[PDB]
Amino acid sequence: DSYLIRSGNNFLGILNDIKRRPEDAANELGVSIEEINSIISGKQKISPSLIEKAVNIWPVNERDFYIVSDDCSSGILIMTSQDSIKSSRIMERAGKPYYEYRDTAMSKTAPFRPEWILELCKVENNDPENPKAQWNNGHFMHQFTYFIGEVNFYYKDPEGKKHVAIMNTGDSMYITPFTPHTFTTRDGASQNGLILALTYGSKLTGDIQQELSSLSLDCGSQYALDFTNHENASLSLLEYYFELSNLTKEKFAKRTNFSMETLADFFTKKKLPTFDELKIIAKALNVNSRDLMPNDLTESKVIVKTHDQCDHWKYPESGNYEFYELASTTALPHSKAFEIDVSSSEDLNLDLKVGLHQYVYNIGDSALTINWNYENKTYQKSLNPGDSAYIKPFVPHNFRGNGKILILRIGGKISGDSQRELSFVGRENTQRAISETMQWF
Template sequence: MNTNNIFSSIRLRQIINDLKRRPLDASKDLSINPKIFNKYLQGKIRIDENFVKKAVKVWPVNISDFINPKYQKTTNYKVMRFKESYKTKRVMKRGGKDYYEYRDTVMDRDAPFRPEWIRELVYVKSNSPNEKDLKWNRGHLLHQLTYFVGEVNFYYIDKNNKKRAAVMNTGDSMYIAPYVPHTFASRNQKCEGYIVAITFSDKITNDVQNEILNFDKKKIKEIIFNRHFKNQNKVTVKKFKEKRSKSRSPFQIIELAKNKIIRTANFLQFNVKKNNNLNLLNSFHQYLYILSDNFKLKIEKKIIKCKKGDTVYLKPFTNYKFQKKNTKILVAQVQSMFSNEALEQLFHIGEKNFSRLIKDNTQWFKQ
């Protein structure tokens, strides 16, 4: 597979195999000389935009079906240092006043996370959700898990459409569902508190949004809103509570805010109790926020020394270790496309056929 091309010859082979076209049949469909078409299949001629436009007009396929997954090179992890985050800081005003200081933390094109470090720049004298200096947003599509550091208030609209205030301190956490209006403010006059706002997409992906665009309003109501799903609280607030454990595990794992709307997501704080070499591996996308200086992280065979405020993204199925005692780390886990159902179907494909799934560029039968 040529990694320099946006469109993939292997994907082209997969498409014509799925459509039960031999190269001769496919070339006839697209009015291309069979010898030329075979060169496209072999990667000797670059598949370009015009080829793809013609193919999607003739065949029941999408442009995305041709995309080369190797075009954008990626690694199985990404690190963003505190100093790099600091360089991205920008102050956003609301109502003409400085309201938030935003800083980027680690993001990756393959990750569902769009997380930010946010310092609250408005000081409030009371915990009333009707404080005059509060400026509310309209909510956003992404789910949000939030970790609090310092004296920060979280304000939100509850299920009865009433304004609420949650008085938060270091270690407290919350979850807020899409499109729930909310805001934050500081109870500290120096505005030293901040939040780690981990916004992310879960089941409502761009593909789902694109499908919904094809529905009319009546269909949407029939398909979604006439179903008898159980209503869930759209906001979860959880106070930090450190539990003593007699477990022999090298970690104390503290579960932070969780909600049934995002059943497969996890929000955790790992306290490393002792030096260890325990390997961790799972199928989640993972966002790590380092809470301690001198944190030691091993990813695959590479040792990465981290400081407080560094952030790390781990792809699914990446080996990693939290090795150094008396250190802490925040971990958000979001299910990847490798659900149990997907893994089961891959299992039934079998090891023998697995390589075909990845790089098969042959016809599905022998002539």
């Protein structure tokens, strides 16, 4: 069984990390040595009673004993429009139906939650202060949203002031976590407005939040550096990595051959270091110049993009699709969002391949085909209007037919730092890096 095999390899990896042999685990856990090997080999699943014993005697967490089962074994997971309709549920705010929510395609293995949210409350004006709008206070999640119909998008700025974005079909937005927001339909639309939202944690949720939450408020918040703009962000990084080195300013000065005057102007923001001097500073702090660099610019908390601003182009050179760049922010370089006009007759030429998680939604009125390859097998399935899909990273695929799709790409926890650490380990070691099948000696 794929679950039992991966569950034993996971338990074996826990034992390797605490430097316990199967015999050491058996004695400390008070169980037979064959019982341990039975778990490691995947003959039987570990019992919660044994997990409780391990957590009571070892610096391990119960979380580490429960693996995620792959509910997307073919490479792509499609949910039908019919299934989504049956999942409909009405959300009432202020004692009246406000949202209609439907499940769309998602995987237990993918770190995103999509939202199909129909706007049932109708507003008579575009006033952000309209009492009919029922606000939330924000969430500790990233959120991309695609607008279909006459949707008003309300949000509050950091100072608490209410704003509104008058949206139409093809508009898109991103909101920084904890941005309060809500959605309504403008009175007079031929039908209720609709949003397709992608909610995801990126680098903020799961055990990353649990590492942060086990710190005091005073300590945990000190990770948040002053990134209000480029100049302040570059000083914040200079201060953080200076503290990490535990150098004095004199030693820092002698090591960079910078004068104390040149050093003081940097730490007082009087003079910003050049890129050549940032190379010298990074070498002296034993970090990379990349680590001292801020983002090229600081983005707005709220990014709104109307469809007229979406640059577009044909892809590939042969012209099978027309891509449309939806809303994006450089705070999330691995979050991509596209409108794709598909015009290509059915062929098994796989011309799309991207190293990201993908959420697909057929927003057109015509049926499309999706072809892909996964584990040396080529598949072909239909993606009707209202159908959605999850596509695993690096899956080679195409879309065929005449129609329109929504494509949302996120990096999950892999893209960025983890990917770079996995690159220094070497592709040769990827299999063992993914799931340990060997005892360490």
